[PDB]
Design brief:
Entry title: Structure of GH84 with ligand
Distance between the termini: 53 Å
CATH topology of the largest domain: TIM Barrel
Name: O-glcnacase BT_4395
Radius of gyration: 29 Å
Keywords: hydrolase, TIM-barrel, inhibitor
Bound molecules: the ligand CCCCCN1[C@H](CC(=O)NC)[C@H](O)[C@H](O)[C@H]1CO, chloride ion
Number of helices: 16
Assembly: monomeric
PDB class: hydrolase
Structural class: alpha/beta
Largest sheet: 8 strands, parallel, barrel
Strand content: 15-25%
């Protein structure tokens, strides 16, 4: 499956052997990076002049002057041809030639090419990735892998802007990178150039920028240092700030100053891009005039970024129309997927979909803001590349499958399995959701409704569920030990562990359903409980970031199914045997029996908290030093806070409330406790 799919393709049923003897036409004049890919692919082959002609060059070269009528007249376009007589690789420009070779390399199979003619070019001028997230910035090694990936998928744009790089954002945006980091960025730029990617260095100065000479000069001096490191494209971001830095006239004046004194003075600056403060429609205040002020004042060559109708949204026709009218140019899309920096306990490994496929003329650019997990982001990045290049032929599902097969050929089916059940975000403040476990979600829902009602579940539904849990176990175990993409496996391992437990738990719960004696049922019940404890353990020891710590997997369909099935079948056992098995579905070492009630406790880092729900005594599992207690809202009944180690003698605590390291085991109140580790 050629990816991205070319604009125009005609294939003949005819194999052509990659020629034992070739004559290279235009090797000396075509894009050096293209030529280098070609020599690699023709290794162990006789170059001679008693050989099949290989014509490579850009439009204007002598080597390809025959084919000027065939070469699309678009930036980054190319003509490619293979037949028994000769091979032609002719870009409209140097990048076009490089892109002909990326398609060519995909056509090569066993040492044999199809007889084919291709005319190709992108529908969107700028295509790629913005490293624009909160969290651990991508490692240097990850970035070098990214750039190679982008070259292979004809993404021409990489915008460097990790929110948490102190030399990118406030206050050290003012400071040059130190030597080590600088040397690394120099390397990134060279590798980007070799892979035909524009390295766009962004700066994020808005939270503390002063609209004076001194800060304008420092910004320009920083840009100058980046230029000395090889950077030839630049961005200024004003996203997620408050204060004077949000002033549109000042932002526009700054960017036009950079444009006229820097970008237009240098011989060789490409992209100049800004991210507005109102970067989506929901954040745009119609009582003011912010967007129309940028649109009217910002020089027109400068790009203006946009995430859609909301912070996290997919791009529609009416949406891009709405923004474009206001900024008086086509928006450069900043698509906030698969970025997971607000749901950091989930991986987002599903297909890329929802963006209108007919609106390519209406965008200046399209870039994705990915997860801090670089390798795992390649599923979405690969797909965005395909979409951006040829949106008219964008095939959501096939592209996803092709991405996975590219990233992990040794275990693509195992990755598909893992990815299909790790795609939803779960509940979040943005309300953005993705499908998950779509394949099995009707059989899951029929089974559970029937089981609950005391009707006979369809056998086939039961078996689908069994198969699913089995496949999940196989996929988890295989993925853990795969050495083809070690950095991918490092990224996902905690979730792979949790995923395997989820599957084991599912199996044991199905045996509880099927179970036909008391003793066997009890063994399975005990096992489920222990598995819940293992999941808690992984949730408390992996991915312990400050915002959404821990590891959630298969959340949309499968964990609910298992939980509700367990709860239900425990209820039926208890009725049947007049027993009192606990039907809780998540392990909790602490207890909270209490008035006013059914809310689970959660542990997050060194906090113990009552689940907030939409419409009071905690006992911990030990004595710990207390830090504080914070409480909020949601309540009718007309309250008095205390603390204890034995739940006999109680110290009242005032009110937020500090605990001053006093020993705590019990908290009472007729909601979060922090304790010391
Ligand atoms: C309440 C506001 C949430 C911030 C949303 N954005 C940020 C800014 C942005 O969208 N820039 C265009 C970061 O880029 C981040 O990664 C992404 C998703 O959380
Ligand atoms: Cl189904």
């Amino acid at each position: 499956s050629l990816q991205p799919p070319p604009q125009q393709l005609i294939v003949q049923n005819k194999t052509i052997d990659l020629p034992a003897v070739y004559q290279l036409n235009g090797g000396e004049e075509a894009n050096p990076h293209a030529v280098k890919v070609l020599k690699e692919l023709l290794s162990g082959k006789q170059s001679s002049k008693k050989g099949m002609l290989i014509s490579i060059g850009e439009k204007g070269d002598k080597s390809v002057r025959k084919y000027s009528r065939q070469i699309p007249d678009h930036k980054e376009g190319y003509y490619l041809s293979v037949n028994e007589k000769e091979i032609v690789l002719a870009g409209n420009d140097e990048r076009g030639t490089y892109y002909a070779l990326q398609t060519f390399a995909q056509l090569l199979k066993d040492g044999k090419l199809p007889e084919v003619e291709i005319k190709d070019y992108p529908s969107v001028r700028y295509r790629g990735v913005v490293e624009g997230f909160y969290g651990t910035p991508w490692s240097h090694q990850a970035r070098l892998s990214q750039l190679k990936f982008y070259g292979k998928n004809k993404m021409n744009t990489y915008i460097y802007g990790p929110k948490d790089d102190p030399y990118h954002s406030a206050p050290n945006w003012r400071l040059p990178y130190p030597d080590k980091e600088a040397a690394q960025l120099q390397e990134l730029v060279a590798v980007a150039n070799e892979n035909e990617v524009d390295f766009v260095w962004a700066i994020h100065p808005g939270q503390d920028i002063k609209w004076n000479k001194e800060d304008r000069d420092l910004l320009l001096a920083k840009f100058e240092k980046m230029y000395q490191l090889g950077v030839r494209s630049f961005a200024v971001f004003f996203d997620d700030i408050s204060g004077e830095g949000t002033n549109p006239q000042k932002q526009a004046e700054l960017l036009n100053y950079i444009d006229e004194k820097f970008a237009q003075v240098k011989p060789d600056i490409n992209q100049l891009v800004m991210c507005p403060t109102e970067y989506n429609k929901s954040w745009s205040n119609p009582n003011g005039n912010y967007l129309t002020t940028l649109g009217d004042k910002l020089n027109p060559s400068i790009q203006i970024m946009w995430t859609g109708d909301r912070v996290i949204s997919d791009i529609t026709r009416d949406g891009i129309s709405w923004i474009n009218e206001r900024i008086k140019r086509p928006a450069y899309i900043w698509w906030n997927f698969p970025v997971s920096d607000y749901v950091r306990d989930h991986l987002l490994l599903g297909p890329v979909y929802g963006n209108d496929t007919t609106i390519a003329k209406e965008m200046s650019g399209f870039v994705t803001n990915p997860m801090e997990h670089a390798e795992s982001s390649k599923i979405a990045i690969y797909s965005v590349a395909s979409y951006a290049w040829n949106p008219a032929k964008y095939d959501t599902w096939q592209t996803w499958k092709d991405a996975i097969r590219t990233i992990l050929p040794s275990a693509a089916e195992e990755l598909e399995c893992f990815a299909m059940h790790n795609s939803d975000l779960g509940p979040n403040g943005h309300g953005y959701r993705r499908e998950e476990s779509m394949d099995i979600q009707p059989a899951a829902e029929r089974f559970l409704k029937a089981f609950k009602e005391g009707k006979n579940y369809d056998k086939a539904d039961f078996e689908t569920l069994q198969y699913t849990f089995e496949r999940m176990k196989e996929s988890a175990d295989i993925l853990l030990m795969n050495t083809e993409n070690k950095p991918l496996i490092v990224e996902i391992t905690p979730w792979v562990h949790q995923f395997k437990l989820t599957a084991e738990m599912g199996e044991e719960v199905l045996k509880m359903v099927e179970g036909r004696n008391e003793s066997y049922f009890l063994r399975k019940y005990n096992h489920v409980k222990a598995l819940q404890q293992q999941m808690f353990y992984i949730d408390q020891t992996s991915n312990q970031n400050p915002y959404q710590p821990g590891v959630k997997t298969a959340t949309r369909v499968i964990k609910p199914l298992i939980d509700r099935t367990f709860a239900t079948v425990v209820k039926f056992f208890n009725q049947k045997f007049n027993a009192h098995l606990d039907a809780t579905t998540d392990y909790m070492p602490h207890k909270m029996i209490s008035n006013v009630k059914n809310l689970p406790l959660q542990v997050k880092a060194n906090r113990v908290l009552i689940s907030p729900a939409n419409e009071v005594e905690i006992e911990l599992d030990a004595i710990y030093p207390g830090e504080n207690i914070q409480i909020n809202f949601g309540k009718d009944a007309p309250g008095r806070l205390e603390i204890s180690t034995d739940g006999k003698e109680w110290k009242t605590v005032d009110l937020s409330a500090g605990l001053q390291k006093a020993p705590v085991k019990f908290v009472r109140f007729t909601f979060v406790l922090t304790i010391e580790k």
